[PDB]
Structure 1
Amino acid sequence: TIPHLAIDPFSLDFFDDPYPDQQTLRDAGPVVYLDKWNVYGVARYAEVHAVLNDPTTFCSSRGVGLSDFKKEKPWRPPSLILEADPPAHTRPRAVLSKVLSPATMKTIRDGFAAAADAKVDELLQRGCIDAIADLAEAYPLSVFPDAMGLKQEGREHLLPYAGLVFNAFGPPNELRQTAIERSAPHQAYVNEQCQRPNLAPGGFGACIHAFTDTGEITPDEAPLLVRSLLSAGLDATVNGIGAAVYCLARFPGELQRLRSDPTLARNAFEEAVRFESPVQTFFRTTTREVELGGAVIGEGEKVLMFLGSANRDPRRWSDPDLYDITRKTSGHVGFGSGVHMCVGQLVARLEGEVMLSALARKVAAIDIDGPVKRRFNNTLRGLESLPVKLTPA
């Protein structure tokens, strides 16, 4: 049978320390039922990977939040890529894959690297930073909106709106109702910024629009894809970088290894993505009755995937609670898995790689310099404040 648990994965206590409850979720069985929200849940690597790699049984077109779009009206027009299934998902997926492709990385790498190095040097002209306010947020705010091709102003909308989106994937708790209620202004700005005239060419958004004459996407779809990049392209990377700095502070041996060989920077970042999993959870909806882990789930049921749990499953990872910058990270689900696997993962890995490389070449020590404060969000895991003293190299 399926065990029934009262754990609330969208409660502040859970956000404050999810790992005990995540173990309870893994050990209760391959498939659990969360009575708090009447949803099924999967927290082991095996089942998370199985669900992710069966997107037509466990579909996304009925929403990847708790809300089932077949039963409730979406708070915003459904995402044409995240909240779509094959075949509708194809050509937007391919378009964003070409926009955020290797070649585009070739076009943005030097700028991103210069911005990273420059921020690290600016903060060595500081010493005692809040690694969130001064580094994790500042850098992606200083590079990503430009890479999107957004006008200089209104970029401030980006952090709110993104956050809003991620709070909206959660249940109707006070975080979600907090986010959605009267968020109109952001919704306005974003809507206006997704239009071709307001996006500087050569940026990601203008390239999306540019692809509208190829027959993969139509002109009415481009603004929603620009919206997608503007919603998923900032806060996740912020929390990811904050996670990387956090780990390097908590595992000084790993910082020393990284300094010794800056070429591990990329894998360092990847390990942080596994270790903290900035995107903690995502939902699917069953399109039919389906058997998973010896249990049977009815049609039209929400299934909650615990990505961070899958990334700390001792059934899959040796020493899962240890940050190891030489760990082989292939197979982790911090970026998802399958047809929906993060189409912008090269951008995230670029930002994190160049930031951790800057730290590696320019910083000798990172020692937490105050109270660590967590940032609470229905979907995202990250830090509100990470006070550290940076000792230069």
Structure 2
Amino acid sequence: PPVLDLGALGQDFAADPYPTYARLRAEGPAHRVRTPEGNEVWLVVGYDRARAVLADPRFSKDWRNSTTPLTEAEAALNHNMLESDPPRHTRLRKLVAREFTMRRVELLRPRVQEIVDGLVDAMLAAPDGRADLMESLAWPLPITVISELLGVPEPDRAAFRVWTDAFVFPDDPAQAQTAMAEMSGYLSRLIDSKRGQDGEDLLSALVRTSDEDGSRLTSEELLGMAHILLVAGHETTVNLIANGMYALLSHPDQLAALRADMTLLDGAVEEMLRYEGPVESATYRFPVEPVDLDGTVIPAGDTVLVVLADAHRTPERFPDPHRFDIRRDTAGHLAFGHGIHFCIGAPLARLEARIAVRALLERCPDLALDVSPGELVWYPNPMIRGLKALPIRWRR
């Protein structure tokens, strides 16, 4: 067909892109499109095709295989595991795998609970029983966790809402590059601040690993690792919490069910990921050779987006897919990807989301959405499903 312009679809396409994705899926697996930002890319839609492409080594994540150029500021930060293939990817992920196991992340539970308690206390102080859930919770909890973990001092953390705000929804191209340069310069000064201080946080550890053996972790990869750990876990966990609570509060049958039986909570969190998880499309992939998908040939070097949102509405794989149902069999969702890059952070994402959902339900009586769904505004980006705000209210 021709290329399909997505920016030239309404705020409607941002508010509910799923029917567009479903229509493409009925035509085939791979489609050339143009993003609202302006970029010519491929979409891959359909569960079985998504799953497969995420795990197919012909699809590289190394920008050396892309025909798309990076700016200087972007180049300085691509020395990370998510934008690598084996063997670099293998080497890099070994350095932090131990820190993100289920058993190790469980040790954080008391602290995370303590962070959520304080954030909810503060919220419930509001005199008119209303708040924005983003400002009060979905946003502060994950920065706070990832910031203690890596050793970002308190005063420096606000900057991150601004820097990542510009990576998602900039005012223009040039401010994304400025944020990037600004963030890179800050992570170097932070990294240097750790050297020689004998600190026991994750970033001090990495500084020591790099200093001990530059071939295991170069100083560009050291920066890249700090960068990826911050970003990758933060834009995503924020919007999971926010979207997830939005799904629950816009499906009051399901909210009631979970109140009545809080053993259902983990299952609910998984269905929050399946139904409206923050990663709408996976991160860029570039074919190392022409790749044929039901007779559509995607050329070597092109940018390919696996549309996870659409794999999640594929009825052959998720029955009655438009239904939000916290008891559903969710095993096999691709919210955390699939394959060698499967999310390193998932045990932490889950731990925070489970604790936040439960605190809200247990401490807010008659908790409720404080606008209509049609009033909410979603960020247009086809890679990130997220709200501008989430007005709620409760009794008192």
- Given the two structures, how large is their TM-score scaled by the length of structure 1? 0.86
1:341 maps to 342
- Structure 2 residue 285 is the aligned partner of structure 1 residue 284: yes
Distance 1:71 1:142 in 2: 34
- Structure 2 residue 32 is the aligned partner of structure 1 residue 30: no
Cα pair distance change 1:333/1:248, threshold 3 Å: same
Distance 1:18 1:34 in 2: 14
Distance 2:17 2:31 in 1: 16
1:106 maps to 106
Deviation at 1:88, TM superposition (A): 1.0
Deviation at 1:214, TM superposition (A): 8.0
- Structure 2 residue 329 is the aligned partner of structure 1 residue 328: yes
Superposition pairs for residues 220-259 of structure 1, below 5 Å?
Answer: 220=219, 221-259=221-259
Superposition pairs for residues 71-82 of structure 1, below 5 Å?
Answer: 71-73=69-71, 75-77=74-76, 78-82=78-82
- Structure 2 residue 203 is the aligned partner of structure 1 residue 201: no
Deviation at 1:273, TM superposition (A): 1.8
Cα pair distance change 1:233/1:200, threshold 3 Å: farther
Q: Is the 8 A contact 1:31 1:295 kept in 2?
A: yes
Paired residue secondary structure (1:327): coil
Cα pair distance change 1:195/1:91, threshold 3 Å: farther
Aligned match for 1:52, one of 51, 54, 61: 54
Deviation at 1:261, TM superposition (A): 2.7
User: What is the letter of the counterpart of residue 251 of structure 1?
Assistant: H
Cα pair distance change 1:62/1:265, threshold 3 Å: same
2:377 maps to 373
* 1:98-150 alpha-carbon deviations (Å, 9 max, x no partner): 22222431321110012223323433333211111222113223333122221
Deviation at 1:27, TM superposition (A): 1.8
Cα pair distance change 1:180/1:378, threshold 3 Å: farther
Identical pairs, percent: 29
Cα pair distance change 1:103/1:312, threshold 3 Å: same
Paired residue secondary structure (1:346): helix
2:16 maps to 17
Q: Which has the higher strand share?
A: 1
Cα pair distance change 1:35/1:346, threshold 3 Å: closer
- Given the two structures, how large is their TM-score scaled by the length of structure 2? 0.86
Distance 1:328 1:383 in 2: 26
Q: Which has the higher helix share?
A: 2
Q: Is the 8 A contact 1:131 1:245 kept in 2?
A: no
Structure 1: stretches of 5+ with no match in the other structure: 169-173
Deviation at 1:348, TM superposition (A): 0.9
Deviation at 1:391, TM superposition (A): 3.5
1:131 maps to 133
Distance 2:111 2:154 in 1: 17
> What RMSD in Å do the two structures reach over aligned CA positions?
2.8
Paired residue secondary structure (2:43): strand
Distance 1:321 1:207 in 2: 45
User: What is the letter of the counterpart of residue 389 of structure 1?
Assistant: R
Mean CA deviation greater in 366-375 or 80-89: 366-375
Paired residue secondary structure (1:324): coil
Q: How many residues align?
A: 381
Distance 2:10 2:177 in 1: 18
Q: Is the 8 A contact 2:291 2:300 kept in 1?
A: yes
Deviation at 1:324, TM superposition (A): 1.6
Cα pair distance change 1:76/1:219, threshold 3 Å: closer
- Structure 2 residue 201 is the aligned partner of structure 1 residue 179: no
Distance 1:216 1:47 in 2: 37
Cα pair distance change 1:22/1:291, threshold 3 Å: same
Distance 2:188 2:9 in 1: 31
* 1:336-393 alpha-carbon deviations (Å, 9 max, x no partner): 110011111111111101111212322333322134233344632111111111248x
Paired residue secondary structure (2:107): helix
User: What is the letter of the counterpart of residue 228 of structure 2?
Assistant: S
